[PDB]
Design a protein around this ligand. Structure first.
Ligand SMILES: CCCCN(Cc1ccc(C(=O)NO)cc1)C(=O)Nc1ccccc1
Ligand SMILES: CCCCN(Cc1ccc(C(=O)NO)cc1)C(=O)Nc1ccccc1
Ligand SMILES: [Cl-]
Ligand SMILES: [K+]
Ligand SMILES: [K+]
Ligand SMILES: [K+]
Ligand SMILES: [K+]
Ligand SMILES: [Zn+2]
Ligand SMILES: [Zn+2]
Length: 722
């Protein structure tokens, strides 16, 4: 959706209650004022839209809590310290203050205010900097510093006031939000996900129902997901793997209309309560991942987090993601630990019968375009699909959708022969160069020496412009002129080999760009090449086959070698050679038409876990749009919204340094709409609606499992297969 702005709720009332009988109490006013001070210091506060708090009404509290409980809580405001202590002692880990009720009402109300702004598209997203927390509060009792269940009320409120059918509650606070679990235990309309320290019940709240076996009951069976950690010192790699392999597949199947986050920061490094080692930066990635599930409709509310600085950094990292700032560099490993893999696998097995998605297992944007690249043409067949108008139609669509004016225009330039020699033989360079002065008879003769190649006197210059345009784009990204970019270029490149032209490709644009990126930074710069063109990029695979500095990932229609380029080199068992073993990932599709379900599943279980463990410094996309719905050559059904979601996933890698390079794509409308959607994502627009992602075709399930088996010894994040 086209909503903009990040809401922030903060009122002085959030500091007007504290523990009267213990000055060392961790749940203190400084928690929220430290967060507010850092947001201001980091320049984040001034970038947010200030949203006023409001007091929750009795009717809204009654959506979750009993009348008797609400009346008892109301009466605490007139109590003495002695009366407050006597009542607090009746609950587990709770204090009371005469200002507690008033602040708790404004704490619930602040979330309802953000829910209103987000559900009416006044804002895209928001964060409530509230205290007291809420996720432990139950229908009739206080618990773990909570009086009212903020998010449980907000979810039921969203359903009643804004006609939301499905709400997803994600709880990344180090403790299990048993309050939320109990309230929605039998409710299929509210999916509750909690990741928490458990240690076989030895960690507070010491509940057997905090285990992965508690999947909900009655109509709500399968709608309660617990991810218990049974070892301390969990890191960002563990949280990110859990979101990739478990939460995202389920969330996409659930299709919520709203995402609510119980945003606790007690899992962050330095928290005295948590015992975990999660970097604050991890929360930027987690927040980014949640933007894709409800078309950006995302509300975060502060839960726990007791190290003042750690909590403030966690809030700042999440806020940066909500505002659309590029994802940060992750300071730790992209690989999960064995204990985390064990917990993720157990949760997957416990929720497996309820979710088809789990049943698979056995910033500035640059734009480059030059109309001169239209000069390359087929003089013998004017209807040949690799049309000059492919690039002009894509460019026109960017102008119609007003994307062009939002981009920084990067000039096209010719690649030099020295730059072509980064990937190609001097013999191949000279043969293509010679075509510039050839008569039509000689151009026909030369084209026939290759597999699927047409040449004109303008072909060599167009191929130099396609390569040079991508080098200028990679240079703009790596020198900080832009964060990411799109290259509307032709002829394509991924079929071109070191010593030969092939399948409409003269020079390997993506391969040359990866080597060029390395020549302007360092030889070992980690480059990820994601090739989503419907055909296997045979040339790219071969160029980097023995290389561990360039990870090549291709998704392609294979059909047991019956589809172009018709070689067994495209099969899943081709994992690379020598030090490059594990750095060549082929995802071959067999048995007809694939679409968004299969592509999203391949990204959740293969592309994203491998890419995150590789930790690229630059992401290149060999973006052919010939797997698109309507393509005359591909026969596939990837929709423009499908491509937008794939682009969105890749943006959390390489601190957002993503270059989208045009490859194939032959339906002019399909490629114009698909590539425009990718640019829209790079620009930071909310991911669009994307329904019906299950069931997958049976043969796609076979393909994904074949890949997992081939790459599991190389990549730990794949060992989620028990
Ligand atoms: C012996 C119990 C171990 C865990 N807890 C309880 C607890 C409950 C909730 C949260 C929380 O993060 N709530 O949002 C943190 C700790 C505590 O240690 N709580 C505590 C209570 C009073 C003073 C200092 C600490
Ligand atoms: C017997 C060959 C079968 C595959 N090919 C060739 C081909 C090569 C490369 C690509 C491609 O997407 N290159 O970027 C697509 C098709 C074709 O079908 N090519 C074709 C040529 C003219 C008109 C219509 C289609
Ligand atoms: Cl020819
Ligand atoms: K939790
Ligand atoms: K539920
Ligand atoms: K491909
Ligand atoms: K490689
Ligand atoms: Zn907590
Ligand atoms: Zn192709």
């Amino acid at each position: 959706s086209k909503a903009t702005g990040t809401g922030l709720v903060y009122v002085d009332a959030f500091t007007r209650f504290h523990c009267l009988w213990d000055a060392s109490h961790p749940e203190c006013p400084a928690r929220v004022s430290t967060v507010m001070e850092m947001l201001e210091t980091e320049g984040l506060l001034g970038r947010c839209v200030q949203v006023e708090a409001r007091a929750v009404t009795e009717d809204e509290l009654l959506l979750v809590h009993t009348k008797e409980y609400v009346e008892l809580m109301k009466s605490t405001q007139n109590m003495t310290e002695e009366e407050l202590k006597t009542l607090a002692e009746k609950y587990d880990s709770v204090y009371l203050h005469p200002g507690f009720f008033s602040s708790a009402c404004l704490s619930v109300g602040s979330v309802l205010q953000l829910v209103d702004k987000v559900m009416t598209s006044q804002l895209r997203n928001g964060f409530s900097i509230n205290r007291p927390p809420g996720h432990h509060a139950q229908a009739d009792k206080m618990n773990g510093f909570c009086m009212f269940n903020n998010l449980a009320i907000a979810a039921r409120y969203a359903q009643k006031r804004h006609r939301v059918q499905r709400v997803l509650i994600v709880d990344w606070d180090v403790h299990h939000g048993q309050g939320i679990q109990y309230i929605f235990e039998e409710d299929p309309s509210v999916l509750y996900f909690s990741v928490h320290r458990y240690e076989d019940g030895s960690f507070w709240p010491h509940l057997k129902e905090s285990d992965s076996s508690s999947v909900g009951s009655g109509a709500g069976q399968g709608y309660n997901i617990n991810l218990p950690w049974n070892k301390v010192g969990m890191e960002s790699g563990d949280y990110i793997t859990a979101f990739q392999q478990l939460l995202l597949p389920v969330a996409y199947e659930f299709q919520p209309q709203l995402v609510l986050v119980a945003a606790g920061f007690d899992a962050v490094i330095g928290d005295p309560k948590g015992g975990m080692q999660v970097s604050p930066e991890c929360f930027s990635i987690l927040t980014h991942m949640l933007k894709g599930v409800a078309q950006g409709r995302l509300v975060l509310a502060l839960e726990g987090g007791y190290n003042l600085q750690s909590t403030a950094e966690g809030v700042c990292a999440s806020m940066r993601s909500l505002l659309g700032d590029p994802c940060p560099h992750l300071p730790s490993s992209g690989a999960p630990c064995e204990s985390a893999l064990k917990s993720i696998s157990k949760t997957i097995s416990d929720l497996y019968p309820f979710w088809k998605s789990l049943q698979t297992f056995e910033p500035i944007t640059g734009l480059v375009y030059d109309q001169r690249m239209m000069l390359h043409h087929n003089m013998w067949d004017s209807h040949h699909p690799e049309l000059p108008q492919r690039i002009s139609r894509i460019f026109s669509r960017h102008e119609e959708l007003r994307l062009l004016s939002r981009c920084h225009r990067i000039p096209a330039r010719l690649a030099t022969e020295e730059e072509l020699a980064l990937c190609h033989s001097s013999k191949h360079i000279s043969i293509i160069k010679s075509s510039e002065h050839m008569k039509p008879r000689d151009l026909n003769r030369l084209g026939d020496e290759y597999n699927s190649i047409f040449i004109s006197n303008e072909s060599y210059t167009c191929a130099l412009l396609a390569a040079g345009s991508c080098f200028n784009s990679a240079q703009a990204i790596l020198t900080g002129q832009v964060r990411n970019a799109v290259a509307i270029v032709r002829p394509p490149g991924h079929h071109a080999e070191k010593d030969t032209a092939c399948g409409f490709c003269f020079f390997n644009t993506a391969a040359l760009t990866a080597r060029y990126a390395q020549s302007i930074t360092r030889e070992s710069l980690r480059v990820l090449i994601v090739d989503w063109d419907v055909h296997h990029g045979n040339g790219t695979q071969h160029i980097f086959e023995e290389d561990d500095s360039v990870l090549y990932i291709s998704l392609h229609r294979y059909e047991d070698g019956a589809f172009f380029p018709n070689s067994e080199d495209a099969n899943y068992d081709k994992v690379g050679l020598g030090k490059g073993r594990g750095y060549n990932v082929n995802i071959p599709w067999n048995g007809g038409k694939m679409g968004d379900p299969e592509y999203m599943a391949a990204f959740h279980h293969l592309v994203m876990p491998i890419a995150r463990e590789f930790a690229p410094e630059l992401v290149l996309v060999s973006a052919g749009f010939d797997a698109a719905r309507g393509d005359p050559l591909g026969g596939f059904q990837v929709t423009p919204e499908g491509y937008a979601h794939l682009t969105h996933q890749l943006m959390s890698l390489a601190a957002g340094r993503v270059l989208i390079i045009l490859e194939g794509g032959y339906n002019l409308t399909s490629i114009s709409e698909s590539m425009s959607m990718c640019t829209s994502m790079l620009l930071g627009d909310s991911p669009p609606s994307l329904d019906h992602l299950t069931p997958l075709k049976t043969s796609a399930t076979v393909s994904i499992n074949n890949v997992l088996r081939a790459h599991a010894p190389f990549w730990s994040s794949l060992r989620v297969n028990i």
